[PDB]
Amino acid sequence: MIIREATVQDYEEVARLHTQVHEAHVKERGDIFRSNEPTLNPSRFQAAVQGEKSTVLVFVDEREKIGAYSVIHLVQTPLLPTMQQRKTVYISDLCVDETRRGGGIGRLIFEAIISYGKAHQVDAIELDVYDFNDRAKAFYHSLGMRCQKQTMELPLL
Amino acid sequence: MIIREATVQDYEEVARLHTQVHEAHVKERGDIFRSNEPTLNPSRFQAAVQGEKSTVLVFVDEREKIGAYSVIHLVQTPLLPTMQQRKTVYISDLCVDETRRGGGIGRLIFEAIISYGKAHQVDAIELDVYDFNDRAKAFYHSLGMRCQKQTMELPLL
């Protein structure tokens, strides 16, 4: 059991985790999300892994299998007249293998993100979650996260 | 009373209204929002007024007095393997003068925005609102709006 930075060789396993979460979003919001195979572009994954401001973390179990992964970004907004300069870690992905959920792995990954965040003296960790996603909302709430803002919608069709 | 598109000459009044709302945000989330005079850039207002994909609407009820305004944008996202192609109206601003509230003015502006969305056959109207902003949430809820997704935060500093 370790958390390490991902390599490009982790692609297939991470891609599989991404598709679990993506298919859940297709199911609930098919007006926004579309089914595709794969759901994670291998070149885009490689870019995240090697990116200057991005980092991919994996949780690897006792049998050297990927049980979870996350993609994070160090984000800097410039000073503006009406907005504070702000440095954040943005989590664009955090997936735990569906059959390994409810057993500590997500929290372990997130603790590593916090460690990274603090070492870079960021103001906050941020992420976006779809409103239907009760499981994610409960998880992130349990970690001390709260709503900053929300996207509201009025369908017109 | 009338609703019409803004002109450049509307800047000073529209700016004053923008400032009421900006200051509210500075008050409640000074970590994100910064005080400045003005809070609305005049050139950027002009661009919104004349923009190809943007529209500025004002409610006029009194001589030399704008009671409300809104800025909206026609947004189109391309077909991707994993995301549906999407056409929306995005409301970047909608302010009703603090002293003119409680008389249906916001609703009238929003109805105009709906008509715009329909005329352009958009999938939906969208906007973002900050979590502290109970007054705006109740207003948008009352007009049929629902939460699509939310930004969550964990301050580290």
UniProtKB/TrEMBL annotation, chains A, B:
- The N-acetyltransferase domain covers 1-156
Q: Which GO terms describe its molecular function?
A: N-acetyltransferase activity
- Fetch the InterPro entries from UniProt: Acyl_CoA_acyltransferase, Diverse_Substrate_AcTransf, GNAT_dom
The reply to whether Lipoprotein figures as a keyword in the UniProt entry is no
Keywords in UniProt for this one? Acyltransferase, Transferase
Question: Transferase: present as a keyword of the record?
Answer: yes
Q: In this record, what's one Pfam family?
A: Acetyltransf_1
Q: Tell me which PANTHER family the record gives.
A: DIAMINE N-ACETYLTRANSFERASE, GH14572P-RELATED
- What is the protein named? BH1408 protein
Origin species: Halalkalibacterium halodurans (strain ATCC BAA-125 / DSM 18197 / FERM 7344 / JCM 9153 / C-125)
